[PDB]
Amino acid sequence: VLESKSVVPGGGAVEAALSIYLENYATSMGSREQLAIAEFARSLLVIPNTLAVNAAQDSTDLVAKLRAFHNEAQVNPERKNLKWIGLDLSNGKPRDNKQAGVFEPTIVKVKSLKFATEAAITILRIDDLIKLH
């Protein structure tokens, strides 16, 4: 937190927020790019749901409570709660503790996004397929 001033509710919570926003943006752009962002976006929603299952609070319960707080005029980053955006990950249901140690800052969470994309680029990077006897 000291190294990078900027912070987020980390884990899958930044992810749950971003799904809706990257979808509003996907639509807006249109064409081939709408799919590109939209597949990127739905992949973000799935991680906090899968996490929920583990602590046995389930996927269905998780999505339901969370997406409501986000809105189209609550796209704001703020600095105070008027819409929730965190998600305690031990609780496995969204609370209103906004500084828990189950959040992790910007430094880890930016590189989480980049490494998941890279795996798609790389497997693709090949040109040519051969068998060598």
Partner: protein, 201 residues
């Protein structure tokens, strides 16, 4: 394998070999879905048949595994590379990746230009990162409710072994501030292993 075995070493051509690779990619990930979070679950990996290890960390699991496909191979290394970096993000990174690789070969193939299709994925992460930078709503310990006192309190309540966030909140505030060695890596930072934490029974 599936398809023809006219050729070998993970070649079967056409639709079949792509299908084979993505399923396998998915199997790794599924192990790490259950081990995801601080709520993660223990797995048993049998390493011969006279040995066992119990683990619940995402990168660790994947290291002992026997890759035998190119998709297998790139995905374990991605997790381990992330373990080298910080060792945080390690359970998550795999899970997102499984879904991405399958979707994208379809969309890159459905090109107008392949560099453009990959760039859309980049465009989604560029907004994401930007957002991430803009945020100071949750996990701010420097403009907290009680600064570092509140940050520690909530952390000890999330990882509670008795009654904690009481005496234990105050400790966290003291230890960071007890080191007066600034380590300039982007803003001033303190080591949390230059502290002395002692046990007494």
């Amino acid at each position: 394998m599936e398809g023809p075995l006219s050729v070998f070493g993970d070649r079967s051509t056409g639709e079949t070999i792509r299908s084979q690779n993505v399923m396998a990619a998915a199997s790794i990930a599924n192990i790490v879905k259950s081990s995801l979070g601080p709520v993660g679950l223990d797995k048993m990996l049998v390493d011969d048949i006279g040995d066992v290890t119990i683990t619940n960390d995402g990168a660790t699991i994947l290291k002992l595994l026997e890759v035998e496909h190119p998709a297998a191979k790139v995905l374990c290394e991605l997790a381990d590379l992330q373990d080298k970096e910080v060792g945080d993000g390690t359970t998550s990174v795999v899970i997102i990746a499984a879904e991405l690789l399958k979707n994208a070969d379809e969309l890159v193939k459905q090109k107008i230009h392949p560099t453009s299709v990959i760039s859309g994925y980049r465009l989604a992460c560029k907004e994401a990162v930007r957002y991430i930078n803009e945020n100071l709503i949750v996990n701010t310990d420097e403009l907290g409710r009680d600064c570092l006192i509140n940050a520690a309190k909530t952390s000890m309540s999330s990882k509670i072994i008795g009654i904690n966030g009481d005496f234990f909140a105050n400790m966290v505030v003291d230890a960071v501030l007890a080191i007066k060695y600034t380590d300039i890596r982007g803003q001033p930072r303190y080591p949390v292993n230059s502290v002395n934490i002692l046990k007494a029974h």
